[PDB]
Symmetry: C6
């Protein structure tokens, strides 16, 4: 329940398995696509182009299917 | 010091919570896990919620410390 | 940054002063400060809900408070 | 090194101010006290305003600016 | 570029030159004036009275005319 | 860390790629990235302007960047 011991494995699994996600922004806008990569502050989401979403503007990330969770 | 043992308890006892977001949206479910920056909330699929986007975590029944 | 914040919150906590917490989205929560740390405040009423400080705009006691 | 002396000037001279919050709310009163994260705004009661919720501090009259 | 290596010079230039700016806040509100001074966390915006603006509440700083670093 | 944000922004800059920058309040800005630091981006064209990153939600390149 500490560090990034949750967020990183999670995003990585989404990326590795190319799971389609919805990313809801803090203003309620919804983005959809696949996680191409990410770092400590941003997530790169694919579709028409690969856009760079700032984590500070994201509220939730909702995978289109259940997925392995971090250990 | 308060946040962790608190979230810990909600997770452990599997108490259904309402998570209200900074824009007013209400999310509902059970807390599977959480780390320093995010909380994993469980329903149909488990979704990842950034804490910076949360205003309040409201348990649907009272708990202790 | 907790040289005014902490004693202020602790005073509200020890004396159980009824307070309103207003959120950045305008939701007004009412109750009392059960407890707090560096990042959240635990506000009591029906249940005790955990409030993220980053989401708070103001804390408004129902009555004036010493310090 | 600028924020501090400014706020302190508003405090010492008891200048009436409007504080606009990031959501557009306008609070009025005077700066009673402050630390790194919050401002104690006095009027009906003295409430605690988190600095992160604030967009601007606007004095009702021109005031000495920090040199 | 690292750190404040763009923000400080850019602001410090708008300051020195007394260029009229529009400052948009995260809520869509537009302030206008001249940058009197600034530090790590706030900008003092000068007009009828100077006002102290928290950088955290600002989205964009738009000069009234082109400026050169 | 910045192992992605920085090379991404620098590639946009060096290659003069047109971007649309969407702010947290839903307003969309367009132009080329002239410069950037850890905290702000300088956007240029029909109007030159300094953008705080904390107020940005997405940077959408008008064509794909290749690391
Ligand atoms: N100190 C505050 N912090 C954040 N929001 C406030 C505050 N005071 C008032 N508001 C909001 O702005 C609205 C207008 O307030 P107002 O009509 O002047 O009455 P008030 O005594 O200042 N607060 P209230 O007792 O809740 O009505 C209120 O209804 C609140 O929603
Ligand atoms: N030493 C300081 N001097 C002046 N302002 C500060 C200082 N430290 C933090 N702040 C402000 O207070 C906020 C930082 O507190 P923080 O614990 O990060 O909550 P927050 O994330 O800013 N709340 P929010 O922006 O609504 O998500 C920022 O807005 C800062 O601008
Ligand atoms: N210095 C400021 N900082 C943040 N918001 C402001 C500021 N000045 C005005 N506003 C906002 O702008 C709107 C109203 O301002 P405006 O129409 O320009 O005149 P006014 O503020 O109503 N005049 P007054 O309130 O009597 O000083 C409100 O939404 C305010 O929140
Ligand atoms: N998991 C979520 N995270 C953030 N916002 C959400 C989430 N689910 C729904 N919303 C928002 O809640 C609001 C209500 O719409 P809603 O009826 O829930 O749509 P839907 O049923 O397709 O999810 C919408 O604005 C939507 O963006
Ligand atoms: N360069 C900019 N930076 C940030 N916000 C902007 C910018 N230009 C326009 N806006 C915002 O767009 C919003 C739309 O308001 P509006 O009444 O249509 O005037 P305008 O079309 O000039 O923007 C405004 O609230 C303003 O905040
Ligand atoms: N890639 C994005 N990142 C952040 N916000 C976006 C993005 N794309 C669209 N939006 C938001 O969605 C809203 C409108 O969506 P959009 O369909 O693109 O507009 P339009 O209907 O004019 O084509 C805008 O207010 C904008 O803020
Ligand atoms: N954010 C919120 N919105 C509505 N009711 C609430 N009760 C506790 N927190 C709440």
């Amino acid at each position: 329940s500490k560090g990034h011991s949750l967020q990183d494995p999670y995003l990585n699994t989404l990326r590795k398995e190319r799971v389609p996600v919805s990313i809801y922004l803090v203003n309620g806008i919804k983005l959809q696509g696949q996680i191409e990569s990410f770092d400590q502050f941003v997530i790169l989401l694919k579709n028409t182009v690969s856009q760079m979403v700032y984590k500070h503007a994201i509220s939730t990330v909702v995978p289109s299917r259940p997925v392995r969770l971090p250990s």
